[PDB]
Symmetry: C3
Subunit: 114 residues, 3 copies
């Protein structure tokens, strides 16, 4: 799986341990091994949410399976919680796009997961 978070919060406000916490908690939540979890954090972005430049985040989580109604609500509670606690971003200023990827549509190690 891969998780990306784009935010206008400054890089200095990202705490030590963040990428590792995201990796471990997403491994727990998705049921996938941590060695297959990739994370990308993009601070200092020029963005607005509702026309306001208060802290916000636009994110995405891609996974082959383990994407659905209840699961996505669980991922959103987990991720909004981390973004609130660690980056001080209000949950109502976060959007997370979820993608259930077909294994044939994910390349890795010179081939695909199909």
């Amino acid at each position: 799986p891969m998780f990306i978070v784009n935010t206008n919060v400054p890089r200095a406000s990202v705490p030590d341990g963040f990428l590792s916490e995201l990796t471990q908690q997403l491994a727990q939540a998705t049921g996938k091994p941590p060695q297959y979890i990739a994370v990308h954090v993009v601070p200092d972005q020029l963005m607005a949410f509702g026309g306001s430049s208060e802290p916000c985040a636009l994110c995405s989580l891609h996974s082959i399976g383990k994407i659905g109604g209840a699961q996505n609500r669980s991922y959103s509670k987990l991720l909004c919680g981390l973004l609130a606690e660690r980056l001080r971003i209000s949950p109502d200023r976060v959007y997370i796009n979820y993608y259930d990827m077909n294994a044939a549509n994910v390349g890795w190690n010179n081939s695909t997961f199909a």
Copy 2:
């Protein structure tokens, strides 16, 4: 909805008011409340379009519904128009990927927009 624009145009060339104009015009175009419109502009990128590095933009618009044949052509006219007028990017050097998101696949405020079944 969320609209992202990635471009090689310098940050200095983005005019004051641009994020607000995109927010307001997308609210008008999609019929969605402006309070729910998010925008992200990424300048100074290393990109090429057709192998040339003249000004260009690669964008995306994600919305739960309001994505379709005629609507997407209307959004493209609006957005290419704004990118040409404000960032001086030629419309034929702009790609915009449209995504019709299912409500269950959009997280917000500790949950998603699928609040009907559990």
Copy 3:
């Protein structure tokens, strides 16, 4: 088509000509004219793959058609080979998301690639 590469490799490590090489190789692989191939490389990113910050890349390839089981295996061998050769990134630290776009969902030049119906 559009190909995006996000990596933690430093900008100085992206060779001159890399965008052009990707453009040419992708035009060849997809059969699409190079004039329609867009590439975006984003170095110096804060990323981890499997909990490690050694070189890695998260990428995407969007194309209207020319996306499928065998074609994607071929694109992966091609692209991982280029990322390994040019950016020194191990293929097992590379993910590439493939998207088969509908023509009506790709905006370009004030409209979309759905020009047949109203």
